[model samples]
Target: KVFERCELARTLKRLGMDGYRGISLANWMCLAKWESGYNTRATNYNAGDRSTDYGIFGINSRYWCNDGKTPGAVNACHLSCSALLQDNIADAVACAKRVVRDPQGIRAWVAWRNRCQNRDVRQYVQGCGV
Candidate 1:
């Protein structure tokens, strides 16, 4: 029921994501849904209209970190207000990849899914496909 709101099943396919179990899949889906609402062209207006951008992943024009050029924001390079607004699948995927380095973030997302009753998240295992 709740999974309908996230629409993760569709996003996973577009993002080329692959999970080992329903739990893991649902776990990351929660985050992605929260972040981009499964809309690759979705932008984050929660804060305000800092810039102009849109996409399923919500990639913006300026890179958030600073580099704004690299694939993903790392070590506080550039923090583009609208960087993650849309059409930044490369960066989105990169961000997901980096999460593995810090289990805390991943674990947190997983826990959230469990608490939210999104058991489909636990199936995550293999790396996310580009």
Candidate 2:
């Protein structure tokens, strides 16, 4: 499922992530835009490591999710990557919160590092009223 920018902001705010888990809603919006363009079914494979990134937040199979068929997958989130491909984002948001709690914090997302870190992200949610 894909979402409009305002819809994404409203949902993220409603989820209490506007500033929850040490990440601002603006930053999360920026990361989500760059990661998957708010497409819940987004998935990408990195041939360099033969790993995959899943969902709107781009959680990685190498550490966060298990393909179940992939050997040595940590399965830290304890669910298949397919769980993130649905319209309901409850599981995706839950897993993302856990990732933010890690030592890396919000920097866990390279998208955040490359695009949102130290940047003014207010424009991402300019009219969302978040």
Candidate 3:
């Protein structure tokens, strides 16, 4: 599912993504934009590492979820990568929350660093009715 930009903002806010571990909804919005462009079924395979990033937040198979083919990658989120691909974002929101629970916080997402860090990300959520 390709979510509307403002709708994604409102949804993430409802999911408690706003200010979770000091990461704002806008930052999550920014990461999701750069990572998957709001597409719930978006996927990226890393052949070099044998890992895959799945779903809107691009949660990686190597460290977060299991895709049954990650060799020895850890499943820190205790989730099947399939869970990240659903149109219902509840599981993806839960796993994304777990990712920031680590020492890295929001920086766990490389796209956040490259695209959202230190920027005026409020623009991502502006007028989203959140």
For model 1, residues 106-128, the per-residue Cα lDDT tens digits are: 55343343444434444332344
> Which candidate has the top score in TM-score?
3
Q: What is the C-alpha RMSD of each candidate to the true structure, in Å?
A: 8.2, 1.0, 0.8
Give the C-alpha miss distance for residue 105 in model 1, angstroms: 4.0
lDDT of 2 by residue, 1-130 (tens): 9999999899988887877776788988998899999999999988877788999999999889888655577988887899988898888988888888889999988788889999999899997776
Better of 2 and 3 by lDDT: 3
Show model 3 residue runs off by greater than 4 Å: none
Comparing 2 with 3 on TM-score, the higher-scoring candidate is: 3
Model 3, CA-based lDDT: 0.92
Model 2: how far is 56 from its true place, Å? 0.4
**Clash number for each model:** 49, 0, 0
Off by over 4 Å in 2: none
**Candidate 1 local lDDT, residue 106:** 51
